[PDB]
C-alpha cells in the first residue's frame, strides 16, 4: 500500500548558508594570496569613535590564472540541486537531484557585470528577492555570453550589436515581470565609490575600472570602454582602502565572458508606466548567489 514519492524541497537562494560560506572563503583566499602593500581600515570603540588603522605588509606581485573550485558535501550532509526550468530560486522545486559537489566555479570579484559565470539553459532569467522592492538587487543570468576583451592599453572591447541584442532581451524579460506596456530604460550608475560607479573587477590580480556609461544608456561594430588599472582602491572584503604594487610585465590583458549583470530599479512613486534600471553590485555575495542559487545543503535524514 505504501506509495513512491519524489522528495520535494523548498529553496531560498537569498538565505542560503552556502553563499556566506563562499564569501568567507574568497576573503580567505584573498587575505592569503592577494595582500595589499598598505591597508587602511576604521578602528573603533563601542562609543562610536573611530581612528584609521594602518597595516603595512609584504605584497608580492603574482600573475594568477583562475583556479576552478567547487563546494562538496561533508559526511552526514547532502547537497540538493533544483533542476526546474526557469527556476525562480525561491519556493518548492519539482525536479530535485543530489550531488557530491557543486559545478566547477571560476569566482570573480566585480560590479555591474558578472564575469565567467554559469549561463541559463533556456532563455535569459532575472531574479530578485522581491521585484516590488526597488531596494532589492536584480540578478540577471544570460543564456548567451558576450565576450569582453581588455588591454592594458586603457580600454576593453565589446561587440556592439551583441550587447545591443542583450539589452533588448533583458528588457523583454523585465517587461514580463513588470508589464508588457511599460517602457524599459537603462541608465548609468547614480554614483558612489568608484568601484560601484564603474564596471570594476580583478583580472589576473590587477584591478580594472571601466566607464560603463556606453553600456547602460538605452531606449526600448565595437563598443570601446575607457578603462584604467588602479593601485589605490576601496576594499570589497571590508570598509577601507588598499594599495597594491604596480603591474609587472606591462601590456596587461584580460578576456572574459559577460554571463550576468546586477541591476537596480529606480524607486518610482511617479506614475508613468516606465521603469528605469541601472548597474548595481558591491556586496560580492550577490555574485556568489548567481552561481549557488540552485543549491541547498541538507542533513542526511
Amino acid at each position, epitope marked *: 500500500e505504501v506509495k513512491l514519492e519524489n522528495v520535494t524541497e523548498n529553496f531560498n537562494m537569498w538565505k542560503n548558508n552556502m553563499v556566506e560560506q563562499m564569501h568567507e572563503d574568497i576573503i580567505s583566499l584573498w587575505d592569503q594570496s592577494l595582500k595589499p602593500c598598505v591597508k587602511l581600515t576604521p578602528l573603533c570603540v563601542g562609543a562610536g569613535s573611530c581612528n584609521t588603522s594602518v597595516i*603595512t605588509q609584504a605584497c608580492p606581485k603574482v600573475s594568477f590564472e583562475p583556479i576552478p573550485i567547487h563546494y562538496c558535501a561533508p559526511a552526514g550532509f547532502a547537497i540538493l540541486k533544483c533542476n526546474d526550468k526557469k527556476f525562480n530560486g525561491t519556493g518548492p522545486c519539482t525536479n530535485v537531484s543530489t550531488v557530491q559537489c557543486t559545478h566547477g566555479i571560476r569566482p570573480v570579484v566585480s560590479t555591474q557585470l558578472l564575469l565567467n559565470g554559469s549561463l541559463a539553459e533556456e532563455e535569459i532569467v532575472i531574479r530578485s528577492e522581491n521585484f516590488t522592492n526597488n531596494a532589492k538587487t536584480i540578478i540577471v543570468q544570460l543564456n548567451e555570453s558576450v565576450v569582453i576583451n581588455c588591454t592594458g592599453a586603457g580600454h576593453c572591447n565589446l561587440s556592439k550589436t551583441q550587447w545591443e541584442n542583450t539589452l533588448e532581451q533583458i528588457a523583454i524579460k523585465l517587461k514580463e515581470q513588470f508589464g508588457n506596456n511599460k517602457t524599459i530604460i537603462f541608465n548609468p550608475s547614480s554614483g558612489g565609490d568608484p568601484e560601484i560607479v564603474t564596471h570594476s573587477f580583478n583580472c589576473g590580480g590587477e584591478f580594472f575600472y571601466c566607464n560603463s556609461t556606453q553600456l547602460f544608456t538605452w531606449n526600448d561594430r565595437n563598443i570601446t570602454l575607457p578603462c584604467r588599472i*588602479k593601485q589605490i582602491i576601496n576594499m570589497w572584503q571590508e570598509v577601507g582602502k588598499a594599495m597594491y604594487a604596480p603591474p609587472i610585465r606591462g601590456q596587461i590583458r584580460c578576456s572574459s565572458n559577460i554571463t550576468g549583470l546586477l541591476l537596480t530599479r529606480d524607486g518610482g512613486k511617479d506614475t508613468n508606466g516606465t521603469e528605469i534600471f541601472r548597474p548595481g553590485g558591491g556586496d560580492m555575495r550577490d555574485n556568489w548567489r548567481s552561481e549557488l542559487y540552485k543549491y541547498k545543503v541538507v542533513k542526511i535524514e
Partner: antibody
Amino acid sequence: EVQLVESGAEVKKPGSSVKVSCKASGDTFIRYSFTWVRQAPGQGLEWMGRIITILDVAHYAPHLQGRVTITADKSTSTVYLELRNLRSDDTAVYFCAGVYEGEADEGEYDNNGFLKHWGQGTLVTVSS
Amino acid sequence: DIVMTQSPATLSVSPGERATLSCRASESVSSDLAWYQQKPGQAPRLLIYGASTRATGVPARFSGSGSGAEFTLTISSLQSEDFAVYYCQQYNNWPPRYTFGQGTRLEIKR
C-alpha cells in the same frame, strides 16, 4: 620638474624636539611621495622615512623608534619632519627629497623608492 | 636589515680615464638600486635608478649595471665635475626600510 625649499638652520637643546619644513612647488603635490634623509657631519646618508602623500601614511627607519613623525599639508604643499627627545648625536644636515608617483588622484601609483628632487638641506645642531 | 656595502672606500683616477664603482647588498634587492652623486656643501643628485636607468639630465658617460646583490657604476671618461662622493641606495624591501651604502669617494690621481 619641481622645487623643494626647506626652513632655516636650527640650534636645539638636548631632550627637545625640532620640526623641519619643506615646501614643494611646480606640480601636483599629492602626485609625489616625500622622503627625509640625514647626514651627520663627515658621514654618509641615512634614510629616516618616507610619506605616501595621497594616503597620508608614513613609514620610518626602525632605529627612529617613535621619535620621528613625517607629515604633509596638502593645503600648502608642505612636508614636515619632527624628531623628538633630541640627543647631541642627532646633529646633522637634514634633507627633504621627493619623486613623482604618477596619477595618484586617479588611483595610479608607482610607489617609487628613489629620490629625484632634493631640498637644499637644513642643519640641526643639538647641544647644551 | 639590508646592508649596502661600497668599494673601494676611496678610488684614485686620472681625469679622462674610466672608473668603476662597486656596491653590494647583503641580500637580493632585484633592481631597486639607485646611485647618487654628492659634492661637499651640496645635496645629493640622482644619477641612476632601477639599477640601469639613467635619470634625466645625467650625461651618457654614467651607466649603471647589475642586479640581485651585485651592482656597478661606470663612468667611461672622468671629467672635472665627476670627482665627488657616490652613494648607492636599495629600495626593494617592503615594509620599507631603505638604506644607503657608506659611499665611495672619487679622487684625482696626480
